[PDB]
Design a protein around this ligand. Sequence first.
Ligand SMILES: [Zn+2]
Ligand SMILES: [Zn+2]
Lengths: 455, 456
Amino acid sequence: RMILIRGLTRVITFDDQERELEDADILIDGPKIVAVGKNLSDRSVSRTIDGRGMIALPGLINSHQHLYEGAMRAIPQLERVTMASWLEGVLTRSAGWWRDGKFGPDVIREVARAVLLESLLGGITTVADQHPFFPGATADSYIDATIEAATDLGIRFHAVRSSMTLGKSEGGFCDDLFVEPVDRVVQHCLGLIDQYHEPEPFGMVRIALGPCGVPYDKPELFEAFAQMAADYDVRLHTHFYEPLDAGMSDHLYGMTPWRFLEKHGWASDRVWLAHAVVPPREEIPEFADAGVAIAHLIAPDLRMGWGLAPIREYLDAGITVGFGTTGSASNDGGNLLGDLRLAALAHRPADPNEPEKWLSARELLRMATRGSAECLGRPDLGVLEEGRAADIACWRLDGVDRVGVHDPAIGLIMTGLSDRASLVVVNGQVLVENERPVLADLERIVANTTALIPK
Amino acid sequence: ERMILIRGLTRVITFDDQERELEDADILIDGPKIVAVGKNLSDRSVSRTIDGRGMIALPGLINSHQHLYEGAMRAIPQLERVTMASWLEGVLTRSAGWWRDGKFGPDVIREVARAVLLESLLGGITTVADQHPFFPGATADSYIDATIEAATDLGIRFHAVRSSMTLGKSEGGFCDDLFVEPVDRVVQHCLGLIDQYHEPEPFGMVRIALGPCGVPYDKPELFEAFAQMAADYDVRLHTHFYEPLDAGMSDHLYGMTPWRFLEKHGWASDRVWLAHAVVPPREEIPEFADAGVAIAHLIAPDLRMGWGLAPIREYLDAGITVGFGTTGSASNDGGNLLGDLRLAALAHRPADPNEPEKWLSARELLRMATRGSAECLGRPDLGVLEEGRAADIACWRLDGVDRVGVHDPAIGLIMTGLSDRASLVVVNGQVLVENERPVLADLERIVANTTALIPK
Ligand SMILES: [Zn+2]
Ligand SMILES: [Zn+2]
């Protein structure tokens, strides 16, 4: 009862040798890839899928979503704002809607269902969601809602439990009722691991631990989480060197955000860090030696006016770099592949006479697959080879908008009227085919969710 | 012979003199022109009513700067990360090589143009201005005739800008002289093209413009001949403008800035639109305004070649007309104008991190891609959804899963979505796209035919 994808025009593996293949196949057994190569046997195969005219990649992995923000897209007052106005805007709406019973757990479930379905249609097979800018998150069964939506759809899912534990009063940056006692956060997290965490290879739901950041959480939370990570082999995540962070840190602790993390147990290989826009250059070698990973988030970095993270420098230092979209209040889409084009182009003017420093299409596609898998600590994902999860995303190459394309991988980044995936498989299950959801009722999900968006 | 009514569009963006937008409203079409825009329009003499519910309607997008033949030069590994010098050398070498091997004649260019122009319609683009500079040999071959043939077959509105490279490296230029034509040959050819193809009347479907490659690439004698020709025949003038090394090259050759050069040779006028305009001296900007020149913003190639951000806000502040374009697919590498708008919306912001009021808005960008481009091309009949203007219309569906939770649909069109494919597209009153598919063209056959002819 295996599945064979036959005759793929191009296969990008991102294996240890960066192999690519032409007119080749992928054989799938249950949740696992059996083989990648030419003329594989359809012996034990119960189904053969025609891959001709398609390019196949590992499933894309979005290492940074804020699903609840799907209901906050294209709001005119938030179109052109800097971080302070943006943050205030999002925090007030999530707090206001919630208090008025417009943002119940069931509203978040359906918003998550739409953004995760959009994610599948964009070739994204794993999503890591966090909720730093929705205070009522825990007081309303919000991670249970998102996990319910993800499992219904069959998308692989990492739920990052976030918080803002440093109160506006005692030095913080938060309305003193988005604040939870450290032990309360810890205990909620422990319960989530018990209930949902799937640590085995090919696990479909995992829990990670994600304070909002140095300006937002108590050092006691960072240390408690560092302990939990070792205890339960889960991952640690936080925001990192956003503009102004360095000053806020120096003010609270008289040290850099990095020095702070190192002091509280987060300078380790269990850690991935969001944005990393403006670190002191002299700290980059330390990032590398500690083995932290970094998620590049081009859309919000441009949207906020933050600018260009030193990604080339990170790769030069051998640091793991993944990719993410962040929430749809700062993007405002969940289109990861589309955002790769933004990064491909926007980094270039920074080095006008040194094109060798510009990020390539292949470097970017890697970030969105293997790089993100490494950020989430998933050695079972992000690569097309025997033994890895059968998480696969394919795009058609034969459309009128891709005529004259000479290199299909570069083509995926540099051409097209549409980033819609043709064929998407997650955990060996076909979820999208011919650009359409196989199991999900698209029109009904749109109808249901739209009715629930706070008016 | 009746009219067409598009009924109940969720949102209509007119870009009229008041910047009107409507909800649950209609557009009434009669032949080539819009009869009315408003709620509950009459279907008295209507032969067909189209359901516009769930769509946003805009004036058809206008791509004021294309190089169609470059559609055959997409995603070439050797050209992925290159500066202008290497890029230009690679495009010239390849086009010259293919041409001499007999693989890049007008018949091939016709089919490459057919594909890029069909892509254009599918992306909601209703008018394209193509600047073709490639005329190898001893006589100017029928490349323009070929692009016009493709455009007319498809029914897309079309401006053919006859380009050239008349300054050989021997006299300070960049090209293997196989590309260099005598100025008289270019001028003679342009006269014939105007006579044969130009449709100066309102709603004209084919027009001719005159477009040297630029100050570093063409003789001053050509600019002057074209200024005379533009005046005598009432056509427009187009060239590349203030790309990064341009100021130094013009200083070396002429001892004057690119703008002073254009001024001297008859191009500081309201007949002119200018591509890129990345790095002008700030002091010259008020002069652009007083001369009445228009500027086409081309974000994708400006970024792709590492040039950076044109001072678009400054142009708008000065009241200079600003349109939008994609340039050719060797430096984009798509023909997706709507998608390029998101690039501009986001990429300009980090240049003014503390003054978000300076950032280009979604509505300013959509204006550039419609009315701004119309004005670059000298088309008061295009770019606006109102009575008396051409029935060129582009509509997108707002009810897809990837646009759930969108609060403002104009912003949504730029900032969200998995696809830029237009739902319904009308050109010159003819419905050419419906349900994201061509209604008169055979999509699959065109893809197959053109693919077969791409030089490999
Ligand atoms: Zn975030
Ligand atoms: Zn050009």
